[model samples]
Target: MKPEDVIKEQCARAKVVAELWHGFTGGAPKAALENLVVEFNKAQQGRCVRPVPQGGYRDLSTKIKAAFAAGKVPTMAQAFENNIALYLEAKALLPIESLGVKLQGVNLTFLNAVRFGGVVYGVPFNKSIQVLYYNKDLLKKHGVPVPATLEEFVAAAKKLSRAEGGPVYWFQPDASTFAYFFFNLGGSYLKDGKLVLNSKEAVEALTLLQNGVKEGWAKPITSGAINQNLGSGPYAFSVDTSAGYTYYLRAAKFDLGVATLPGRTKGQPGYGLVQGTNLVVFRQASKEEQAVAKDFLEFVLSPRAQAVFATATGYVPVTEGALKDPVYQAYAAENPDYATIVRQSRYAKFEPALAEWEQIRFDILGQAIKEAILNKADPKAALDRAQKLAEDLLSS
Candidate 1:
């Protein structure tokens, strides 16, 4: 039988649907997913592929698995780094390695994230490294230099930003994105496989953030708002994923600039967290279905394919070859900011793979940061409470 027929029959047996949920973040809206269905259908020989929307970081895989158990599962799905735990717990994911050694052309970083206990379970569809995006016109206009260190970042924001209608830059307050800044700076919510939010480093990180709000250089964001405060030139910079390059570029519609995340403290290697989604086949899928998935996945890693995807989507290609592609090389030549992501990627820290880290981060840690930003408590005190709570969570 043809590959499409094989996939169809396999889906019928496994109760899989052609339409699947591909994980997304605030930056990767539905409209940006253009041509994904067309590409998948082409790969599947005209079979339609519909994408189901997966909500934010919290409770994603659990919801997907619950749907699956209730006979409402999609044929395929994508997951973020934090949600991988639920997929592992459900024991409902297929091992990509089971397709055999022929599928080894995938990127190493991709392979690393999908592997748990040394076995591969998913296909890495998109890889993102967190970076700082700055508005060059805004910064230069304000006479503030790019922040090369964390201190410089705060100083620059204070000097450059204003309230929505005022004369200074306003930092957009996002708990998760700010957490990445802290983690990249060598601050950790965990130490010795235990929670350590009480450390001086951790407290200092939150203090810096809280100070941003007090000084009128940052403000909190609520859901459903356009968050154009950054685009309108009132904010000098925002802590966000590199995947946001496309929107920021278009929305700002001016000379945009990008840079590596500044170091946490002076003389330390600054880094950012890697956050993105991976495509995984389901456990119940037949061997032939897995083969077709592998074939398409392998194609995605090809130098040519990687160049096309990266150029089109602004996602960093995971493969060593893709980074070296002629098209990417040319693009990077013109856009040094894009190249900065690849240049600094060597310093990226993979998001914690531990299952409990999900709750520890979102419910406990995120809430603490929110409280501090809103001035409900002191930054140090709020983080101290969160540290104790996270420690208890770790032990439990």
Candidate 2:
């Protein structure tokens, strides 16, 4: 057999030797990886091997660095998109472009997102853009139609609110959903290249959130609490990762509707933020190992492999061809509601890819948003406080 074939066979049979750390859904990891590995083997010409799975919120970059220090890192692994700076600082990542001919035609956005200090150090795998998932049945039951504008959304929510003795339905929102809630309303936390969350737009948008809560139209749910109201059907609308659609569908007892978020007004832009993790290659491996890893990256980026990924995980395929594949296209046709997500992707506002993105998300914005959502302070005040912290973190 050819050298490639030998590698494929070895990898296919390669005892689930290395543990791949994933930071997303714990329940879906196994099935998702199974689909990925199956595609990996096929695309690698059968040289792909099964990887031991360890999916969760594990600090993947740190684990990979430690493993590299101990000479025990996996041949391939995933990392959060926001953690690229950490991997770059540790110098434990491999650059795909420098790995010779192993990887070509991979998405440049994936490469750029992981690049640090002028080097490409990762490939983005398993991305899920944030999309609005609405419950049409709930909307209908409450005599509300699908909202096409933020005003309409507000109107719909108000109309759907269950009177005290009637029903207790609400428009459930999580801490992260504000990005979608605010951005489509022409509210931005940034102005003049600096943090400015106290703007008129921000205040107006945030008041809407607080008002929703007071009116029994909206409430916050913990990130891990997706399964709570999701399956219970007490919520008429909620926003979550597009990937969550599959799980919600499987677990949902009531009819669910998916739709692009309404814009601030009829002519306003719908700029929802894109949220998801990405895979990156860490440095510390020999040239040969890096090359091998790059080959694997190419395999994952292949149209055939991406098809399997979309099929297995319900993540939108990154490749244009993968989007058009019969298998994938059929999924959109079979589940027309999912089309909302794909369509919204065209107008997505990606989370800033600054090197300090981690600090911004975790220590700054996340905390501030939590405070605002929990009523510790108004949204404007909360965001203003968070913005100062973010600016300091970024500058430092």
Candidate 3:
């Protein structure tokens, strides 16, 4: 009998007991993930796995954190880089590589993101990079070519903006958006175990947002969709994760342009921040269960599965094989915007993998951006205030 069949038979006969592969996922992406896990489980060679879909990412994250405190944890769960740092702080994760899984032709930028202290602890899933979303027809109508530099980008937005009061670019006031500009301007958020939010580059990045909003060119948005009012009304550009590509594609009734962000001054070398979660195996699961997870993760990263995931979720696949997969290739051929994002993968960067990053990103820096852009606060002063709070948070 096959090893898989033998295990199945023994398990049914009350010999080697059946085991549970506990895991959690959230939202629409999790639906695709759950489907894949079902397929992976059907193979039967490895241990049986179950998918537990929480309400959403936030719901899942909170549940997992409390589970950790209660000493009852899922075998594995989807986590952000910052989340992994917190898990590591609690000494609660196993090095995923400790199991015997070897991957081939994976995207190195993403692969490296799952590393901690030079050890692989997870694998990238649901990965996406920040991209430029713009109303192509609107830009062309105004005789503005897709901007290649910040100077051009601002001027173009200003031109489209009504001098008195009109919709322009959708300025997403969030951590990741701010991170995109900070990285594009060649600023490092975390350097030598210190927060650099007050650096000249960071201040300049905040100033860009402040100036645009203050000058009535960029609209500070709380609306979820960057493509909101894109075709029907006024919205020139939005800086957001590429995972929303499908929504933008569906909503825009006119030409939609997608590209890498303008992350430089004039002479340009820019980068992007990678978003989404990775699959992390936990410490509580027995070795057999862990091995089962290893097998399943490999399946998830496999080219065929990767193709299915990217097609369903609009997140970029994390392997070269997936990029070349016939499924994704056919889809990309029909939707060129997908390919545009994937082409910029090499330029993707990671967030500060610190446990403190979550609070700092949303509480400190997010507030700084809000103050500067909304309350007419000076960018430098706001970042300085933010830096002090970040330092205080990090220390105590």
Candidate 4:
């Protein structure tokens, strides 16, 4: 038998006599997790795992750091890419693969989010795919069909504009948001070990966004949920995360439509960035505890758990089979847009896993997006400056 299968069976069948503290953030994800833990514990013999909600991501990050410093870190917890970098830099995480967690079932692209230098230290947990969300009533009232391409989107935005200065499109000048446009135009964040933020594709993506702002059809926003404005304000559409579906359902007062986000031209398929945290087991856990953690990890990745979490939290299920699960199928029947969200997960891309990418995305390139799209700076110049700043950061 294969070594991976051998280890998988070992981890699955091991008689673990240890407790696993699974630290995660609070809210919807936590609720479903607790339910799953309860179910998991019911089927267990001599092992128990508890869901420990540690406030928000910030709070949990701080908690993990402090726990690490004090040598009392939880067996496993939700981890961001940056968090993984820090822990791995300090040699504090065990690669889930090393713990016999096979990478075969989950969305392979989502797994890419947690990979580092050929090693995967985290398992994809709650994940979101980018999707195009539009106020269906506004579009129908304006006599616009759902946009299928960038040109259609621009035309739709212009037609939906209340006036010359009214916001037709809700836009956030963050890197991930810009990345939807950038990557769809085939821009690369890095190629051949170099930054390519100033490429023609990059400039074209920025040009399209800046043109909307300059032409008075796109509104630039830095904070608050885009759905809030999409629900009440004059905006017609937003390209946002599928994880925000619950918020959209709650906030939208009008007919809402969910569509796959657009690419550069007509007849083009869509591309999206996968965003969310992953589960990671710390190196500090005892071997027995680690085995329990792996078993619990398998439980959470089970089809039933995936369906439960995605239904409760609006996250895309990590594994493909979860979509066929009766639970998710029922949820999808009631919330039809979820099918649209999951369909687009196939073409999903992700942010770079480099240690510097988090800072580069949010600080340098994200700032450049704001400058070019909102502040009316030259897009090429802004991107050039961003690339240089990133280079300087790497050098230092």
Each model's lDDT: 0.64, 0.61, 0.76, 0.78
Considering only N, C-alpha and C atoms within 3 Å, which residue pairs clash in candidate 3? none
Give the local distance difference test score of model 2: 0.61
Candidate 4 deviation (Cα RMSD): 6.6
Model 4 stretches with alpha carbons more than 4 Å out: 1-27, 41-71, 81-86, 112-118, 162-165, 230-232, 265-268
Q: Pick by TM-score: which candidate is best?
A: 3
lDDT string for model 3 (1-396, tens) is 533343344345431122322223333465576667656765765356655556556677677878878988877788888888888988888887787667657788888888889888877878988888887878888788888787778888888886324757786777787887787777887678676789998988888888778677888876555655454458778888777776777788877788767756545425767888888888887767777777877888899999998887778899999988999999898988778788766678887888878778888888988888778889999999999998888885
Candidate 1 structure lDDT? 0.64
lDDT of 4 by residue, 126-245 (tens): 888898888888877768888988778888888788542477788888887888888887788779977677888888888888988878788887667686555445867888888777
Candidate 2 lDDT at 127 equals: 64
Mark the 10 consecutive residues where model 4 has the least summed lDDT.
2-11
Off by over 4 Å in 1: 1-19, 25-37, 43-49, 56-62, 101-110, 162-172, 223-227, 231-233, 264-269, 388-396
- Write down the RMSD of all candidates, one decimal each: 4.8, 4.9, 5.0, 6.6
Task: Identify the candidate with maximal lDDT.
Answer: 4
lDDT for 306 (candidate 2): 72
Clash count, predicted structure 2: 13
Candidates sorted on lDDT, descending: 4, 3, 1, 2
RMSD of 2: 4.9
Provide the lDDT at 359 for model 4: 67
